[PDB]
Design an enzyme around this catalytic site. Structure first.
Site, PDB file in Angstrom:
ATOM      1  CG  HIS A  14      79.371 -91.559 -21.804  1.00 17.18           C
ATOM      2  ND1 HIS A  14      80.139 -90.517 -21.349  1.00 17.18           N
ATOM      3  CD2 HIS A  14      78.091 -91.246 -21.475  1.00 17.18           C
ATOM      4  CE1 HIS A  14      79.334 -89.620 -20.756  1.00 17.18           C
ATOM      5  NE2 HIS A  14      78.064 -90.043 -20.817  1.00 17.18           N
ATOM      6  CG  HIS A  50      82.206 -83.299 -23.030  1.00 21.97           C
ATOM      7  ND1 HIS A  50      80.953 -83.702 -22.552  1.00 21.97           N
ATOM      8  CD2 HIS A  50      82.252 -81.957 -22.910  1.00 21.97           C
ATOM      9  CE1 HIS A  50      80.267 -82.618 -22.231  1.00 21.97           C
ATOM     10  NE2 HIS A  50      81.039 -81.550 -22.437  1.00 21.97           N
ATOM     11  CB  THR A 108      80.846 -84.848 -17.765  1.00 25.93           C
ATOM     12  OG1 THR A 108      79.544 -84.324 -17.982  1.00 25.93           O
ATOM     13  CG2 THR A 108      81.046 -85.980 -18.731  1.00 25.93           C
ATOM     14  CG  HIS A 160      74.068 -91.309 -20.272  1.00 27.47           C
ATOM     15  ND1 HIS A 160      75.302 -90.886 -19.803  1.00 27.47           N
ATOM     16  CD2 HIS A 160      73.874 -92.576 -19.850  1.00 27.47           C
ATOM     17  CE1 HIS A 160      75.829 -91.909 -19.150  1.00 27.47           C
ATOM     18  NE2 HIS A 160      74.983 -92.955 -19.143  1.00 27.47           N
TER      19      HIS A 160
HETATM   20 ZN   LIG Z   1      76.364 -89.199 -20.123  1.00 27.63          ZN
END
Ligand SMILES: [Zn+2]
Length: 257
Positions: A93, A61, A196, A116
């Protein structure tokens, strides 16, 4: 399994993770005019001088840069936080195009990407216990815009060829996350969630106002990663962002006037 495609993306997540429709979901749009300046908010204390990076992982991911979190070595405190939060990992992301990729938005503006830095509250002992608590995590979010290169990002960019596909990892020691910070630590803060699955409502979000600049060539290398595993049909790892969720009964506070 969950992901970012038309049949398994964010609008599907609620079927396996019903908290997806909860009262404190992330990300959100930050309406700069509605955010209240809070003079009670303290300066953020980011103490990364002793950070020990260990490894970089393509988890299917995103990619995570992992840290040794077995001592107070890389900690976040102050700002809106009570007590001490230990850095466990950072990830990003990003978009298929420079015009999208961030999770948080600012007056509906989407940045090219969002970093993040994930920290857990030492009063719960381990990350897995912390995510079960409403004040378990503090995630420091930093926007990326495309312009000048970020010199401190290039070591990350250059290892991505070695973790192209899901499940690949590489040693990634001596990486200094201070090289990913902007000049100002001015921030917005609100209570929210993981972005997520499992979407747990355990995060104090701290989103920096000042973006960092990265080059087109740096973000283009993010977009060469793969969601798939080795010897599977190539699916570029792009558009791994959740869109803004309803603010509901929350206030976003600003550290700055
Ligand atoms: Zn994140």
């Amino acid at each position: 399994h969950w992901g970012y495609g038309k049949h398994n993306g964010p609008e599907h997540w609620h079927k396996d993770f019903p908290i997806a429709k909860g009262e404190r979901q992330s990300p959100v749009d930050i309406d700069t005019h509605t955010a209240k300046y809070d003079p009670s908010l303290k300066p953020l204390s980011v103490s990364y001088d002793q950070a020990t990076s260990l490894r970089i992982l393509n988890n299917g991911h995103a990619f995570n840069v992992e840290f040794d979190d077995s001592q107070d070595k890389a900690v976040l405190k102050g700002g809106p936080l009570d007590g001490t939060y230990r850095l466990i990992q950072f990830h990003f992301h990003w978009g298929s195009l420079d015009g999208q990729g961030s999770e948080h938005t600012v007056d509906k503006k989407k940045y090219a990407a969002e970093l993040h830095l994930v920290h857990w509250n030492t009063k719960y002992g381990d990350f897995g216990k912390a995510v079960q608590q409403p004040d378990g995590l503090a995630v420091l979010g930093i926007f990326l815009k495309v312009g000048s290169a970020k010199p401190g990002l290039q070591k990350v960019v250059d290892v991505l060829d070695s973790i192209k596909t899901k499940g690949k990892s590489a040693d990634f020691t001596n990486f200094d996350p201070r090289g990913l910070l902007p000049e100002s630590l001015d921030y917005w803060t609100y209570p929210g969630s993981l972005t997520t699955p499992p979407l747990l409502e355990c995060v104090t979000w701290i989103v920096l106002k000042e973006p960092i600049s990265v080059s087109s060539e740096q973000v283009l290398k993010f977009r060469k990663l793969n969601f798939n595993g080795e010897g599977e049909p190539e699916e570029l790892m792009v558009d791994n962002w959740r869109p803004a969720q309803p603010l509901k009964n929350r206030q976003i506070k600003a550290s700055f006037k």
